[PDB]
Automatic annotation (TrEMBL):
Record InterPro entries: GFP, GFP-related, Green_fluorescent_prot
Organism of origin: Aequorea victoria (Water jellyfish)
Gene3D superfamilies per the UniProt record, alphabetical: Green fluorescent protein
Pfam families linked: GFP (PF01353)
Signal peptide feature range: none
SUPFAM superfamilies according to UniProt: GFP-like
Superkingdom, natural source: Eukaryota
Keywords annotated in UniProt: Chromophore, Luminescence, Photoprotein
Family designation: Belongs to the GFP family.
Protein name per the record: Green fluorescent protein
Biological process according to GO: bioluminescence; generation of precursor metabolites and energy
Transmembrane segments: none
Length: 228
C-alpha cells in the first residue's frame, strides 16, 4: 500500500509495557528512534517500577518489526509497513524450556508522529530459582534468523523460531517463540511469501543511568527471496 512512505526518514519510537510474571508486576518505558532505510533501531528502556524481576534479554523480542529493511526486490512482501498508520496487533507465546512461559499482546501503530508499541505481558509457571526469575542469563543476545510465513485464513502473518539465551554457567536456555500478526484497520495488507528476517542486537548500559535499564541497538533485515 502507501503506509511504507511513512518510514522514509527517521521515526521517533515509544515503547510501553506492563508485565506480570508469577505475580511479580513491573513496567518498562522505552524511547528512541528507528531508521527503516537502514533497518536500525536505537532505544533506551527504563524499568519505571524499580527492579526488573526478569532478565533484560528475555524481553528483547517483546519490546517494532515495521523498521526492518526490506530490499527493493522484496518491497511487496512487507506486511508490517502496509498495515500502517493504523498498525497491527502482535501476539506471542514464548515457552522457556524447563521453565515458565510468556504470553504477550501488543498493538503497534502511529500515534501522531511517534511509532508506539504498547504491550501487555503475563508470565506463568516460572521457577523462582530458575534461569529467568533467578537472573542467571548473560547480558547479551545472539544473532538469529526467523522465517516468516503468511496465514491467509487470518489475513496476517505467522512465524515461530527458537531463541538461545546464554546462561552464565555455560549452558543455553531455549526460548521457543510462536508469533502471529493481524492488522488493526481494514485497508489492503500485503501477504508475503516464505522468507525470513535476519536480526542482530547489541545490549549496553548508560554510565549516567542509575535505574535498571537497557540500551539497545538492533538491526533487522529481510532476506530469503531469490532475485534473478
Amino acid at each position: 500500500s502507501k503506509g511504507e512512505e511513512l518510514f522514509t526518514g527517521v521515526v521517533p519510537i515509544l515503547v510501553e509495557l506492563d508485565g506480570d510474571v508469577n505475580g511479580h508486576k513491573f513496567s518498562v518505558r522505552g524511547e528512541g528512534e528507528g531508521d527503516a532505510t537502514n533497518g536500525k533501531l536505537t532505544l533506551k528502556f527504563i524499568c519505571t517500577t524499580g527492579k526488573l524481576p526478569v532478565p533484560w534479554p528475555t524481553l528483547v523480542t517483546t519490546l517494532v518489526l515495521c523498521f526492518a529493511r526490506y530490499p527493493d526486490h522484496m518491497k511487496q512482501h512487507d506486511f508490517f509497513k502496509s498495515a500502517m498508520p493504523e498498525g497491527y496487533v502482535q501476539e506471542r507465546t514464548i515457552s522457556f524450556k524447563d521453565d515458565g512461559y510468556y504470553k504477550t499482546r501488543a498493538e503497534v501503530k502511529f500515534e501522531g508522529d511517534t511509532l508506539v508499541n504498547r504491550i501487555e505481558l503475563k508470565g506463568i509457571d516460572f521457577k523462582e530459582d530458575g534461569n529467568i526469575l533467578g537472573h542467571k542469563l548473560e547480558y547479551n543476545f545472539n544473532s538469529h534468523n526467523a522465517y516468516i510465513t503468511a496465514d491467509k485464513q487470518k489475513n496476517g502473518i505467522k512465524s515461530n523460531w527458537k531463541i538461545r539465551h546464554n546462561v552464565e554457567d555455560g549452558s543455553v536456555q531455549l526460548a521457543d517463540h510462536y508469533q502471529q500478526n493481524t492488522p488493526i484497520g481494514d485497508g489492503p495488507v500485503l501477504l508475503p511469501d516464505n522468507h525470513y528476517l535476519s536480526t542482530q542486537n547489541a545490549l549496553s548500559k548508560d554510565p549516567n543511568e542509575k535505574r535498571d535499564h537497557m540500551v539497545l541497538l538492533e538491526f533487522v533485515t529481510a532476506a530469503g527471496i531469490t532475485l534473478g
